[PDB]
């Protein structure tokens, strides 16, 4: 009766931050209740721990109030059979909302909307009579979003908030032998939502596991581990504090044993009863053991040395009541003298922020996915990850512990959408709610070695609540530093200056919360903390420009210990078309309102875990070996702090314009922080013209746990020499004929013919034989289909006049009209010479001026020479080159320049100069939100079909015009055009990326010279 919906729902606990839970057990590290020490030791599975994951019955309602009392007693006819865990939006019930800042619901704390999507889950299951004789049977939900009430066998059990941490209830007295039934009612919105405003899809449900754990009556209630070291780490102390619940009987003992493999390293036994703590005594229900470990193997992301710790609760006669365990990693984390140290050396964090996202499963995580992510990261030169912005699925820590990644664990607290940001975090009334989001995280994850820093949440301004919570942590677990960026990045609530999007060299001095240039921030008066960016280098779409600038500061300034790139995966979701064809969806694609569109796609990898090209630029910049070339000696520097180059080979090689002349291989013997000298054999040197390039690669000959054999971990290339070509071509056998007309000029020579339209001034067509080559005339191009960064936050509604695109738009770039100023043909001794001039103007303003000369010679080669003039007072153009639509469509593209991957000017350090050959398909980058892409810089020669262009340029080539790109919201809607679109740039502006909501292109990468010159040679084979 008092179990009635009617009664229960009445209190509206989900509209009250003063009730965060009802009848929930305390937090603690992961338990299994093994009843045999070996299983515990070997991490075998505990029969005392049962999963309730699977098929559950579910029914959706628009408001908690629309639930029928019946539900409590019996299933529902119309209840569907759903799989758990899952996100009900993933099943169709309601839509997922992709909003960033702006809260999904209306801001009226602590109220929530009356229309509040309720999901009723139910499960019928069996409890074995043995579980009811003794012990305690409790239930666990690893993640319920956002809040929920619970009934068992028609009785009300409890309530819980906090989507990202476990809620546990003792079912001990509601359970009946055999058949039991659970009724779980999950509310989408609650007062907890006010604290969960992270930039991500807004979903709901029982999205993490459900389990049953059977514990003895007298049991281990919690335990913590700690490791102290001596000056040189040659000796450690493992300290374990154990607490128990139940009746304390003198025959009770505890044994803590430390294994390393099969080998027991240390063991300790004792009975309950701690040291005197105060005037009343000590804890009789606790015991602390201390094990001495000589020459412990240390844990690090470089070498994840782990031990196993077993905690046995037994009686003195040797009888085991129960056992728990955890992996142990010996490491010390400290900030000392402005530096963050790990095991005494200073880290350089090569990290990334990662959300729990699956395109198919929404926010439900699985082992496979976790592992994939981990390996990609490790393969790509990452050390660390930040749990943006809440505690993750438990297994995560374990994997990191094991594979080796540093983890920053973060409280599930984000109130980004309040005004001001502080509003709740400065309010004592939210102190409790917040408090639980921090404390429980710590109680749960504190024993993992991978966790090296605690974070108070994200973007919730800076309030007195943070200060308190930060102090709490420091008191409770001084083993790790605390960080929080809110309120300016350097408040009293953080041990590290941890801004987001601070530029390297430029300051952004917003009122109250400026973002100084990182190099400058450190030397502000009185400042002494280390600086590590919590988010930097916004990887949204065609991005990552300038990435290297960061890497370089990091390397030059000690107190700049790296940062976390934003972010790992694109938060795109899968949708299906008219023919059961899938496609990547984003903000607002689910009729979701209000929404932030593409803003959910900032990953380095696509939702399927396939990489964006940016990923390489990272990989290379973050590489652990560094090179310098001096004469014919290569100096190698190791950035490893703990390990020796012991699975590393260096391959070297010399080549002249793509042609290999020499190769070597040399095994690296460099210690962490060491140098290795490498002298090369006498290097060949040819008479032939061209550039000679040295390229080196570090290879991992043997496979590791996260890499295959032959994995390349680093590389670098240098230009060694140049033999300039002092050779004049063979005087043409033939001579081209010029046929004039009033419409055009024709040039014929051989089967070849070229036509220039005298009215437009462009080369309108060309034939090889009877076949035409163009579909579109060759013409000047000064624009580009806007990248995400060019656009920023500019919308049709709300225009951002500062966004590059807006400027360009406003100035007429996109709609300027050419103007023939001149077009002449002249006959040279051995060639024809065409000469043109256009002016591009908009509203009587001449933006640019293009002046060319085409010169066709007996060789049947045309040489284009171009010279642009850009008005000082017009926004600098995105680019400067030509384009045209070719008639042909070939299978491959071959070029001699940077590649193989897409590379832009402020994003090309990872690319190598060489001869690349790839399929056309590979020259297009499927950024879900179409834009200019696929560029390759420093090209010297490009070959497509019978064409060959030569010079110094950047280019791109696909089946999509710039216009089509520019006009398609999703990549799935693009259609291949008639032939091949070719864009050949003499120059291209950088892509930026410091952030994606303000101009981020550094000046060095802006086409601001005024005068631009370039030349080409088009010809055939």
């Amino acid at each position: 009766i008092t179990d009635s919906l009617a009664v229960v729902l009445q209190r509206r606990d989900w509209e009250n931050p003063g009730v965060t839970q009802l009848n929930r057990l305390a937090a603690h590290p992961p338990f299994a209740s093994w009843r045999n020490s070996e299983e515990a030791r070997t991490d075998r599975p505990s029969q005392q721990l049962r999963s309730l994951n699977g098929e559950w019955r579910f029914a959706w309602f628009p408001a908690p109030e629309a639930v029928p009392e019946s539900w409590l007693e019996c299933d529902l006819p119309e209840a569907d059979t759903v799989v758990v865990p899952s996100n009900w939006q993933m099943h169709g019930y309601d839509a997922p909302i992709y909003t960033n800042v702006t809260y999904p619901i209306t801001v009226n704390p602590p109220f929530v909307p009356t229309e509040n999507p309720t999901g009723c889950y139910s499960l019928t299951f069996n409890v074995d009579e043995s579980w009811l004789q003794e012990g305690q049977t409790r239930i666990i939900f690893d993640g319920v979003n956002s809040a929920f009430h619970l009934w068992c066998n028609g009785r009300w059990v409890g309530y819980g908030q906090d989507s990202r941490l476990p809620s546990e209830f003792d079912l001990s007295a509601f359970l009946r032998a055999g058949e039991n039934r659970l009724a779980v009612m999950v509310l989408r919105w609650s007062d907890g939502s006010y604290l969960e405003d992270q930039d991500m899809w807004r979903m709901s449900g029982i999205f993490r596991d459900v389990s049953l754990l059977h514990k003895p009556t007298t049991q281990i209630s919690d335990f913590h581990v700690a490791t102290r070291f001596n000056d040189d780490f040659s000796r450690a102390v493992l300290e374990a504090e154990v607490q128990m619940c139940g009746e304390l009987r003198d025959y009770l003992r505890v044994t803590v044993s430390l294994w390393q493999g099969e080998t027991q390293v240390a063991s300790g036994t004792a009975p309950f009863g701690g040291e005197i703590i105060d005037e009343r005594g000590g804890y009789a229900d606790r015991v602390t053991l201390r094990l001495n470990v000589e020459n412990p193997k240390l844990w690090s992301a470089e070498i994840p040395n782990l031990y196993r710790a077993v905690v046995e609760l037994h009686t003195a006669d040797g009888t085991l009541i129960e056992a728990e365990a955890c992996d142990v990693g010996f490491r010390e984390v400290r900030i000392e003298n402005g530096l963050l140290l790990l095991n005494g050396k200073p880290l350089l964090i090569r990290g990334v922020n990662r959300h729990e996202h699956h395109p198919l499963h929404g926010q439900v995580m699985d082992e496979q996915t976790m592992v994939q992510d981990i390996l990609l990261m490790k393969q790509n030169n990452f050390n660390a990850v930040r749990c943006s912005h809440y505690p993750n699925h438990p297994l995560w820590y374990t994997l990191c512990d094991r594979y080796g990644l540093y983890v920053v664990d973060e409280a599930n607290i984000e109130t980004h959408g309040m005004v001001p940001m502080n509003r709740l975090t400065d309010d004592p009334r939210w102190l409790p709610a917040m408090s639980e989001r921090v404390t429980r995280m710590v109680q749960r994850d504190r024993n993992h070695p991978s966790v090296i820093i605690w974070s108070l949440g994200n973007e919730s301004g800076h309030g007195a609540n943070h200060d308190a919570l930060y102090r709490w942590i420091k008191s409770v677990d001084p083993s790790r530093p605390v960080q929080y960026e809110g309120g300016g990045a350097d408040t009293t609530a953080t041990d590290i200056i941890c801004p987001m999007y601070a530029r390297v060299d430029e300051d952004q001095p917003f009122p109250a919360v400026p973002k100084w240039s990182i190099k400058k921030w450190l030397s502000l008066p009185g400042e002494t903390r280390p600086l590590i960016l919590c988010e930097y280098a916004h990887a949204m779409g065609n991005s990552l420009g300038g990435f290297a600038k960061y890497w370089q500061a990091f390397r030059q300034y000690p107190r700049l210990q790296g940062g976390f790139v934003w972010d790992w995966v694109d938060q795109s979701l899968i949708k299906y078309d008219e023919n059961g064809n899938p496609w990547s969806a984003y903000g607002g694609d689910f009729g979701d309102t209000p929404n932030d569109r593409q803003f959910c796609m900032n990953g380095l990898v696509f939702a399927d875990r396939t990489p964006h090209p940016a990923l390489t630029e990272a990989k290379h910049q973050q590489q652990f070996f560094q090179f310098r070339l001096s004469g014919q000696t290569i100096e190698v520097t190791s950035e490893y702090l703990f390990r020796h180059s012991d699975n590393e080979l260096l391959h070297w090689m010399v080549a002249l314009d793509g042609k290999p002349l020499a190769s070597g291989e040399v095994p690296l013997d460099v210690a962490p922080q060491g140098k290795q000298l490498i002298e090369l054999p006498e290097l060949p040197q040819p008479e032939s013209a061209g550039q000679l390039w040295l390229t080196v690669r570090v290879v991992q000959p043997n496979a590791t746990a996260w890499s295959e054999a032959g994995h390349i971990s680093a590389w670098q290339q240098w230009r060694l020499a140049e033999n300039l070509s002092v050779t004049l071509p063979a005087a043409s056998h033939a001579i081209p004929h010029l046929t004039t007309s009033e419409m055009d000029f024709c040039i014929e020579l051989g089967n070849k013919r070229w036509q220039f339209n005298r009215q437009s001034g462009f080369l309108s067509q060309m034939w090889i034989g009877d076949k035409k080559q163009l579909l579109t005339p060759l013409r000047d191009q000064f624009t580009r289909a806007p990248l995400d960064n060019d656009i920023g936050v500019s919308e049709a509604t709300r225009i951002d006049p500062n966004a590059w695109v807006e400027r360009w738009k406003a100035a007429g770039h996109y709609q300027a009209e050419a103007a023939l100023l001149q077009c002449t043909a002249d006959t040279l001794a051995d060639a024809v010479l065409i000469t043109t001039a256009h002016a591009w103007q908009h509203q009587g303003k001449t933006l640019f001026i293009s002046r060319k000369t085409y010169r066709i010679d007996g060789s049947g080669q045309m040489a284009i020479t171009v010279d642009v003039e850009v008005a000082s007072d017009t926004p600098h153009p995105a680019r400067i080159g030509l384009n045209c639509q070719l008639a042909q469509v070939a299978e491959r593209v071959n070029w001699l320049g940077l590649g193989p991957q897409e590379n832009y000017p402020d994003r090309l350090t990872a690319a190598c100069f060489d001869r690349w050959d790839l399929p056309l398909s590979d020259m297009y980058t499927p950024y879900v939100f179409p834009s200019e892409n696929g560029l390759r810089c420093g090209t010297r020669e490009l070959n497509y079909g019978p064409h060959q262009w030569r010079g110094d340029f950047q280019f791109n080539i696909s089946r999509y015009s710039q216009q089509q790109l520019m006009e398609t919201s999703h990549r799935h809607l693009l259609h291949a055009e008639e032939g091949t679109w070719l864009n050949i740039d003499g120059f291209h502006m950088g892509i930026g990326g410091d952030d994606s909501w303000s101009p981020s292109v550094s000046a060095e990468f802006q086409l601001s010279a005024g005068r631009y010159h370039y030349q080409l040679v088009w010809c055939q084979k």
Partner: antibody, heavy 113, light 107 residues
């Protein structure tokens, strides 16, 4: 609930292209990763490949570029195309989701002159 | 590629008795080892995933253990419906590969 079913020719000639269709009912093809697995007459199983949500494909190197896996959301089906088949391609072909929870009934395809 | 070797190739047992099947990887695959059952004229059925994780709808008598290179599938008190083929499959690295299989028969 979800159901998968293979369809297509049971007998093909050497050198031709073997093409099978996997019809998915109960849920959208955009809601999972899809695979093709085959069992050779001698009880040997081979994972041919799979297509994930982004459209990226993964093919077994043993298939020497003869394989193509595609999708059609409008028909809620995905396909397997194996070119230049030989007697070595005689096997029972199955479609299943990446998780391995849902499998088709399997269809025998014999390659004979 | 990763090679999975299963042993024994064939195992005969009398219903009621328990058995354990072995699967070893040529190199470490962490916990990415799954177990499948396959009967004549039928598609494979997933029994255990990621070395030891249980699957809804599978008899409780099936359990998995192991990590790295050595894994085991155990059947506590074999039933007649258990006779057939058992294959392990790794998903740690592409291409995914299957073991050669172990045939479980009545003795």
């Amino acid at each position: 609930d979800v159901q998968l079913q293979e369809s297509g020719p049971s007998l093909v000639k050497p050198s031709q292209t073997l093409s099978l269709t996997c019809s998915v009912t109960g849920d959208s093809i955009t809601s999972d990763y899809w695979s093709w697995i085959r069992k050779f007459p001698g009880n040997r199983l081979e994972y041919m490949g799979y297509v994930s949500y982004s459209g990226s494909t993964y093919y077994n190197p043993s298939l020497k570029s003869r394989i193509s896996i595609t999708r059609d959301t409008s028909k809620n089906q995905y396909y397997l195309d194996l070119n230049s088949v030989t007697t070595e391609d005689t096997a029972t072909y199955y479609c299943a989701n990446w998780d391995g929870d849902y499998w088709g009934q399997g269809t025998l395809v014999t390659v004979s002159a | 590629d990763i090679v999975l070797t299963q042993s024994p190739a064939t195992l005969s047992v009398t219903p009621g008795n328990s058995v354990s099947l072995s699967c070893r990887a040529s190199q470490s695959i962490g916990n990415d080892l799954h177990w499948y059952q396959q009967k004549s004229h039928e598609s494979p059925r997933l029994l255990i995933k990621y070395a030891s994780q249980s699957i809804s709808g599978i008899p409780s008598r099936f359990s998995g253990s192991g990590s790295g290179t050595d894994f085991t599938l155990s059947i506590n008190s074999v039933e007649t419906e258990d006779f057939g083929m058992y294959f392990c499959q790794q998903s740690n690295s592409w291409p995914y590969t299957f073991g050669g299989g172990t045939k479980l028969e009545i003795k």
